[PDB]
Write a protein that binds this DNA or RNA. Structure first.
Lengths: 50, 471
RNA sequence: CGGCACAUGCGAUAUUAGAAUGUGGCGCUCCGCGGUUGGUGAGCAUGCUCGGUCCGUCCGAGAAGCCUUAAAACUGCGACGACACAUUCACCUUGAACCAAGGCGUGUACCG
C-alpha cells in the first residue's frame, strides 16, 4: 500500500517470499501426539524424520 | 412429445435412401453446375485480365506456384511457363480484334484455354463474389432510377422497361421519350439530371467491363442458375446421407458432448465431404465421407466439450494415457504406476503427472455432499479474495500513526516524503519528477530523503511505528 | 358424467481407431541475449560548510562527487506456446442411450 510501503522503506524489513500455512491444533482441545505417519510420493527426497 | 432428436428423425425420415447410380447422377449435376459457373466466368474478360495480372505477380517472384492455381489437364514450372506463354500469345492475339463477330470465336478459344486451368477456390470465389458485387451495384442503380421515377412520378413499370430493357445504354429511353411528349415526360424535368447521371454510371460500368449490361445480366443469371442447380444437388445429397452421420455419431455419445451436437458437427463434416467429393476415383460416397464426418466430430469433441479448453494434441496424449493404462491394467494386474509409464512411453514421467492433472473435469458446485441435505458443495467454498477486517483495522491505525508522525516533521521533509510515496494522493513521484516539482536538485532530494529517514529511525518516533511490525 | 394431457403445493426448522508427415505465419507467452530513454532502501549516526546546544551528541540550512539506472518502459535477436493450411498410410460402412416406478393436496386445458 502507501504508508506500509513507507514503513518498509523506513525499517528495511523484507516482506518474505513465503507464508505460514502450517497445520495447527483445532481451537480448544488438548492431548497427546501418539502416532505420526509420513506418506511421500516416490521420486521425492525423503526428509530425516521420514 | 417434444424430444427434439425424435422430431429431427421424423423430419429426416421422409427423405429416402439413394441407389448407387443416383449418387453419380447428383455428382454429374454438380459437374453441370460448376461447368456453367466456369462458362459464366468464361465470357467476363475483366476476371481473365485480373488473373493475368496476378500471374504477372507470380512471374515477378512475389507469389508462388501453389498460390494462384494448382494443376493442369496434362503443375511443372516449365509447364506453367509454356501453357501461360500460349495463353499470353492467345490474349495478345484475341483482345485486339474488336476492330465484333470476328473476335468472338477468339474470345471463346481464350475462354476454353482459361477453362483448361484448375483454379484455387480463393481466386475463383473472389471472382464470383466480385461479379456479385458488380451486379449488386448495377441493380442498385436500376432500383435507384425506379425509386426516383416509378413510385414518385407514378410512371408505369411497363413504360419504364419498354425502351430501357432492350437498349439500357443510350438516351433512346431517356431523351426520346421526353420528346415523344408523354404525360409522364414532364415529371422527368425535375429528375432528368440524376436519372441521366445514373444512366451514365451504367455506361461507366459497361465501359469498365467492355460489354453492355445486356450481356452482363445474361452472364450472371446463367451463373446464378448454374450455382442454384449445384446447390440443389448438394442439398439433395446431404438430405440423403444424414443416415451416415447418425450411424457414425452413435459411437461418441458418452464422451461429454450431447447427441444432437455430435450429429450437427457430423452434418457440417458431411457438407464438407460433399464439397470435396470426387466420384471419378470410383469409391462410393460412404468410404470418402466417413473420414470427414469422423474428423469433424473428433475435432469438435476435442474443441468444445470441456470447460477448460485443452488443445488437440493434449487430448491425444490423454487418450494415449487412457489406452495404454487400459492395456497395462490387464497385463500387470494391479493398475500401472506412472513409473511404468516412463518406460512404456516416450515421455519423462514428470510431464505425465501434469498431463494426468490437466485431464480432470471440474466438479459441479452443486454436487451434493452426503445425506442429500440442502448442503451442496457450494456452501463450503470459502472466499479467499477478501481481506480480514483486522487487517483493515491495522491499515486504519497505521495511516493514523503515520499521519501523526509526518505531522512531527518539517514542511519540506513531510511534503517530500508524501510526494515520494503513495501517501494520501495519486501516483508516487520519482527523483527527476520531484525535481521538476520543486525546481530543486535531484541529489538534494536524496539528501533530504536520507535526512528524513534518519530523523524517523531515532526513538520517540520509531516506537509507535516499530509497533506495527510483529514478532 | 367419463378419458387423455399438463401445471402446481406440501413432504419441518436447526445441528452434522486412429497413426504418421510437412509447410506457413502468429504471440493478451511474462522464457535466454542485444540496443534505447530512463532510477534509489549507499556511503552520510553531521564525508563538507555554517548556526543552536541539553553537546562533542542530537536539532536547523546548504553544495558536491563518486555509486546503486537494462528497475519502469520501448524495439529487435534466441526458446517456447498456441494457431492455420497441406500431405501419406490404416481402419471404419446408412434410424442411439437413458432413469425411475408405493404419500397427501390444489387447479387448468382438450375431447367425447
Amino acid at each position: 500500500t502507501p504508508e506500509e510501503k513507507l514503513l518498509r522503506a523506513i525499517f528495511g524489513e523484507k516482506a518474505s517470499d513465503v507464508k505460514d500455512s502450517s497445520l495447527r491444533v483445532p481451537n480448544g482441545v488438548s492431548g497427546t501426539v501418539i502416532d505420526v505417519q509420513v506418506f511421500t510420493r516416490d521420486g521425492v527426497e525423503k526428509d530425516k524424520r521420514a | 412429445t417434444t424430444d427434439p432428436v425424435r422430431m429431427y428423425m421424423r423430419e429426416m425420415g421422409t427423405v429416402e435412401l439413394l441407389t448407387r447410380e443416383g449418387e453419380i447422377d447428383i455428382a454429374k449435376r454438380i459437374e453441370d453446375g460448376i461447368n456453367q459457373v466456369q462458362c459464366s466466368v468464361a465470357e467476363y474478360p475483366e476476371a481473365i485480365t485480373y488473373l493475368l495480372e496476378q500471374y504477372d505477380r507470380v512471374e515477378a517472384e512475389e507469389a508462388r506456384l501453389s498460390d494462384l492455381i494448382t494443376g493442369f489437364v496434362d503443375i511443372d514450372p516449365e509447364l506453367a511457363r509454356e501453357k501461360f506463354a500460349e495463353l499470353r500469345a492467345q490474349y495478345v492475339v484475341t483482345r485486339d480484334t474488336i476492330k465484333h463477330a470476328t473476335a468472338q470465336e477468339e474470345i471463346l478459344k481464350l475462354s476454353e484455354v482459361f477453362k483448361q486451368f484448375r483454379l484455387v477456390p480463393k481466386q475463383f470465389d473472389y471472382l464470383v463474389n466480385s461479379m456479385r458485387v458488380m451486379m449488386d451495384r448495377v441493380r442498385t442503380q436500376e432500383r435507384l432510377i425506379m425509386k426516383l421515377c416509378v413510385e414518385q412520378c407514378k410512371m408505369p413499370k411497363k413504360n419504364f422497361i419498354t425502351l430501357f430493357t432492350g437498349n439500357e445504354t443510350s438516351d433512346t429511353w431517356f431523351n426520346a421519350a421526353i420528346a415523344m411528349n408523354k404525360p409522364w415526360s414532364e415529371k422527368l424535368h425535375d429528375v432528368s439530371e440524376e436519372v441521366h447521371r445514373a444512366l451514365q454510371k451504367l455506361q461507366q460500368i459497361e465501359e469498365e467491363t467492355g460489354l453492355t449490361i445486356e450481356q452482363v445480366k445474361d452472364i450472371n443469371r446463367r451463373m446464378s442458375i448454374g450455382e442454384a442447380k449445384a446447390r440443389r444437388a448438394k442439398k439433395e445429397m446431404v438430405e440423403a446421407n444424414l443416415r451416415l452421420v447418425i450411424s457414425i455419431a452413435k459411437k461418441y455419445t458418452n464422451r461429454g458432448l450431447q447427441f444432437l451436437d455430435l450429429i450437427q458437427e457430423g452434418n457440417i463434416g458431411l457438407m464438407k465431404a460433399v464439397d470435396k467429393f470426387e466420384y471419378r476415383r470410383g469409391y462410393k460416397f460412404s468410404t470418402y465421407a466417413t473420414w470427414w464426418i469422423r474428423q469433424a466430430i473428433t475435432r469438435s469433441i476435442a474443441d468444445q466439450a470441456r470447460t477448460i479448453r485443452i488443445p488437440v494434441h493434449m487430448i491425444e496424449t490423454i487418450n494415449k494415457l487412457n489406452r495404454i493404462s487400459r492395456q497395462m491394467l490387464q497385463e500387470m494386474g494391479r493398475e500401472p504406476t506412472p513409473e511404468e509409464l516412463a518406460e512404456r512411453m516416450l515421455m519423462p514421467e514428470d510431464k505425465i503427472r501434469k498431463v494426468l492433472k490437466i485431464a480432470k473435469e471440474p466438479i459441479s458446485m452443486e454436487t451434493p455432499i452426503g445425506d442429500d441435505e440442502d448442503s451442496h458443495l457450494g456452501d463450503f467454498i470459502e472466499d479467499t479474495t477478501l481481506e480480514l477486517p483486522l487487517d483493515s483495522a491495522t491499515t486504519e491505525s497505521l495511516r493514523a500513526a503515520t499521519h501523526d508522525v509526518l505531522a512531527g516533521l518539517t514542511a519540506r521533509e513531510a511534503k517530500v516524503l508524501r510526494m515520494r510515496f503513495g501517501i494520501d494522493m495519486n501516483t508516487d513521484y520519482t527523483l527527476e519528477e520531484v525535481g521538476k516539482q520543486f525546481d530543486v536538485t535531484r541529489e538534494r532530494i536524496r539528501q533530504i530523503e536520507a535526512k528524513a529517514l534518519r530523523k524517523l529511525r531515532h526513538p520517540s518516533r520509531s516506537e509507535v511505528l516499530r509497533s506495527f511490525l510483529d514478532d
